[PDB]
Amino acid sequence: KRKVVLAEQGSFYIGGRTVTGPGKFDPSKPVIPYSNEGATFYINQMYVNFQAPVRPRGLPLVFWHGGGLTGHIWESTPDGRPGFQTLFVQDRHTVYTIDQPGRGRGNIPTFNGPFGQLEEESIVNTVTGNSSKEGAWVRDRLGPAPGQFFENSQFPRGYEDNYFKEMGFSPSISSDEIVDAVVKLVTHIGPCVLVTHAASGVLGMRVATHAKNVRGIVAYEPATSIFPKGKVPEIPPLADKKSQIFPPFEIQESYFKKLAKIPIQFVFGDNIPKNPKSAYWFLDWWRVTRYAHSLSLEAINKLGGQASLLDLPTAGLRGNTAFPFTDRNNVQVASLLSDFLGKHGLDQN
Amino acid sequence: KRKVVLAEQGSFYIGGRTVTGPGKFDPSKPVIPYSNEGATFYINQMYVNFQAPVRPRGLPLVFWHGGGLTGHIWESTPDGRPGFQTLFVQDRHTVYTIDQPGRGRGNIPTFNGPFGQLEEESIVNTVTGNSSKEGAWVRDRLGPAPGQFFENSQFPRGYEDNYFKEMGFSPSISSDEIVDAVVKLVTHIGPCVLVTHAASGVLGMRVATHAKNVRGIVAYEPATSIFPKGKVPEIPPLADKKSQIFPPFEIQESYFKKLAKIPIQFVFGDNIPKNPKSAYWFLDWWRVTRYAHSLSLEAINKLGGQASLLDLPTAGLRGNTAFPFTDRNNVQVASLLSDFLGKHGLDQN
Numbered sequence: 145k146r147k148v149v150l151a152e153q154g155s156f157y158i159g160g161r162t163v164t165g166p167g168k169f170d171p172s173k174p175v176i177p178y179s180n181e182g183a184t185f186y187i188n189q190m191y192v193n194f195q196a197p198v199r200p201r202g203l204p205l206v207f208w209h210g211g212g213l214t215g216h217i218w219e220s221t222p223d224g225r226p227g228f229q230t231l232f233v234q235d236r237h238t239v240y241t242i243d244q245p246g247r248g249r250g251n252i253p254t255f256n257g258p259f260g261q262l263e264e265e266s267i268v269n270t271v272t273g274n275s276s277k278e279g280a281w282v283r284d285r286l287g288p289a290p291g292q293f294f295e296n297s298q299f300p301r302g303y304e305d306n307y308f309k310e311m312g313f314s315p316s317i318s319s320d321e322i323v324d325a326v327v328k329l330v331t332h333i334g335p336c337v338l339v340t341h342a343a344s345g346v347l348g349m350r351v352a353t354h355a356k357n358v359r360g361i362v363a364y365e366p367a368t369s370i371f372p373k374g375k376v377p378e379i380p381p382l383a384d385k386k387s388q389i390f391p392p393f394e395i396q397e398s399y400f401k402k403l404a405k406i407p408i409q410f411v412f413g414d415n416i417p418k419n420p421k422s423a424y425w426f427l428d429w430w431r432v433t434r435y436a437h438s439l440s441l442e443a444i445n446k447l448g449g450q451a452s453l454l455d456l457p458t459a460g461l462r463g464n465t466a467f468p469f470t471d472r473n474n475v476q477v478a479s480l481l482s483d484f485l486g487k488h489g490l491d492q493n
Numbered sequence: 494k495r496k497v498v499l500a501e502q503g504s505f506y507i508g509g510r511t512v513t514g515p516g517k518f519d520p521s522k523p524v525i526p527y528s529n530e531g532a533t534f535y536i537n538q539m540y541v542n543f544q545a546p547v548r549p550r551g552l553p554l555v556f557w558h559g560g561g562l563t564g565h566i567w568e569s570t571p572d573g574r575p576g577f578q579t580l581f582v583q584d585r586h587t588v589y590t591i592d593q594p595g596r597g598r599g600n601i602p603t604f605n606g607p608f609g610q611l612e613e614e615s616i617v618n619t620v621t622g623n624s625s626k627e628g629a630w631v632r633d634r635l636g637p638a639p640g641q642f643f644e645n646s647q648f649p650r651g652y653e654d655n656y657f658k659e660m661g662f663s664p665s666i667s668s669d670e671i672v673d674a675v676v677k678l679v680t681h682i683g684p685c686v687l688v689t690h691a692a693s694g695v696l697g698m699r700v701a702t703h704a705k706n707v708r709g710i711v712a713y714e715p716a717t718s719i720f721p722k723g724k725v726p727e728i729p730p731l732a733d734k735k736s737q738i739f740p741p742f743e744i745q746e747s748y749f750k751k752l753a754k755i756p757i758q759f760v761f762g763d764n765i766p767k768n769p770k771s772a773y774w775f776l777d778w779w780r781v782t783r784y785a786h787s788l789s790l791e792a793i794n795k796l797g798g799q800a801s802l803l804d805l806p807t808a809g810l811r812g813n814t815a816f817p818f819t820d821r822n823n824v825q826v827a828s829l830l831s832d833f834l835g836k837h838g839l840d841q842n
């Protein structure tokens with residue numbers, strides 16, 4: 145069912161700062177080709193879209209895309225089925241979707257000169273990085289190697305091109321500045337729930353420690369674990385005995401303690417190996433990253449928290465990739481999110 | 494006013510191509526940091542959003558942002574009033590809004606290495622260009638100089654930060670590939686109307702010559718004029734005796750003739766001078782650019798066309814900037830667009 149009734153919708157920019165070029169601007173001189181002379185540039189701002197149902201119930205949801213993505217992933221699946229934006233407006237929540245600084249409609253800070261460089265100042269690095277189709281295939285656990293699917297896969301097969309086309313690079317904007325933009329959004333919205341994904345997992349945890357308005361977190365397949373400073377537990381290397389997972393983020397315990405004050409759920413899909421898998425780097429990476437997250441959640445619970453790990457196969461959902469909210473069974477994944485919101489009173493006024 | 498009812502909404506990717514790096518991808522080797530080795534990259538694809546009303550009447554509208562912009566400008570004004578997307582869904586048209594290749598949710602083609610470079614191939618230039626706040630202020634005719642506003646201005650004053658935050662750079666993707674993506678969208682949608690803006694004006698004219706499904710064009714403040722090859726009329730230089738407008742695009746006459754088969758309207762806002770203005774480069778640039786467009790429309794009409802130029806002040810609307818569809822009187826601007834659609838039956842089934 146695709147129909148949606150909106151009391152209002154729209155979009156806006158929030159957050160960011162400015163940087164200035166040298167000299168002054170003279171309106172009599174040729175304006176194009178564009179010059180840094182006399183220039184003010186707005187940088188690192190974030191794009192925000194919202195859709196509000198008639199008579200909303202409970203708190204607004206803020207859907208935060210993973211690494212190299214945009215709010216598209218919450219709008220539609222690669223095969224054109226409704227995304228979580230539609231499903232949760234239908235579930236009577238106001239829905240915010242963002243393009244964080246450096247991605248999509250967010251700002252990419254570059255000027256007149258080599259990419260990212262404002263005269264002698266490097267705002268972001270000129271050298272970029274970006275996953276290939278092959279790297280993303282294994283990262284997202286479509287299968288163990290590019291072009292191969294797990295038998296049980298929930299991926300919308302045949303729509304591979306559409307899926308990979310949604311992904312791209314991110315300039316080297318500091319995570320501090322990304323977190324700052326979302327803190328400002330949360331201040332603007334009021335009490336809300338963060339729904340994060342992969343690279344935005346750790347960022348949403350950070351936002352919650354800075355913003356009391358974050359009343360809950362659901363994180364799909366978070367990519368970086370978080371611990372109190374100096375209390376990082378022993379985490380093994382990968383099965384190749386050379387690689388490590390992403391270095392866990394460390395925060396002062398007084399901020400970490402704030403995570404114990406709200407319900408937090410991490411959600412993982414399928415096909416994460418239980419045992420070392422030296423032949424398949426990313427499968428093994430996910431094994432150890434999921435383990436690190438289990439210890440992070442345990443640390444929150446030892447501070448009086450209510451932090452849980454939901455493995456979708458234990459709820460009867462088999463074959464999900466690292467994007468469960470765009471997989472073929474995404475309605476069932478959404479149902480489990482609604483269950484979490486309902487259990488914690490986040491769907492009541 | 495804000496209420497919107499959608500039979501369906503969503504988004505998708507269309508267009509683009511692939512490129513690779515050398516070698517073979519080995520899933521046993523560390524996937525991050527990402528490498529070009531064995532890597533397929535999707536480049537130059539376009540993001541498309543659609544909103545369909547219940548029982549649409551007439552043709553879908555494709556709103557195409559100007560230079561350095563995104564579909565945001567059709568979603569909301571800088572001060573948060575409804576954009577043309579909402580207004581035209583309320584007007585019972587299905588509405589498509591795009592982020593063209595190189596902008597917003599469209600692809601920015603960069604890899605592992607200096608920006609835009611895939612090994613020894615330069616996909617886009619590493620050196621970027623980008624307007625400043627000051628350049629955009631005068632380009633868009635908010636006032637003759639930054640900080641100043643024309644009398645009777647329709648700009649949402651006070652929302653300068655929101656407005657300028659929506660603008661950014663474009664990588665050097667060829668115009669051929671941008672046009673190609675929209676031709677593919679037009680094939681997918683069927684008969685439709687293009688609504689263009691500034692830098693997308695000439696691109697929409699080009700699309701129409703390649704796509705019979707374009708049944709009409711409304712272009713707000715187009716930036717580059719178009720003529721049959723070898724038939725560009727004499728166009729004077731600017732009042733500074735040294736600058737010229739953008740070199741007009743020249744197409745083969747057999748393609749130019751296709752513009753004579755559909756209704757085409759160019760729409761200009763206020764404060765374009767009638768006489769040379771050496772003190773204000775962009776005001777004088779608009780004077781001569783608008784003149785060049787008058788001659789382009791005349792050439793279309795000489796070939797049997799239905800091309801017209803609408804100056805908003807002659808229709809009783811004073812003070813519009815170069816973004817009339819986000820100005821304070823944008824509802825009245827929308828009413829004139831509805832009038833055009835109705836005149837030509839583009840609002841009937």
Ligand SMILES: COC(=O)c1ccccc1S(=O)(=O)NC(=O)N(C)c1nc(C)nc(OC)n1
Pocket residue numbers: 210211212213273275283341342343344367368390391525526527
């Ligand atoms: C949608 O996919 C993801 O969100 C994702 C998931 C797992 C691993 C890496 C990424 S990533 O593709 O974004 N990572 C990335 O681009 N890089 C390169 C990255 N990201 C992070 C968060 N840390 C590090 O190194 C510490 N690298």
Ligand SMILES: COC(=O)c1ccccc1S(=O)(=O)NC(=O)N(C)c1nc(C)nc(OC)n1
Pocket residue numbers: 176177178559560561562622624632690691692693716717739740
């Ligand atoms: C939203 O504003 C515009 O759409 C716009 C409007 C008028 C002039 C220039 C631009 S522009 O900012 O895009 N131009 C631009 O960035 N440059 C640099 C440009 N664009 C074009 C289409 N041609 C040329 O040179 C021929 N330069």
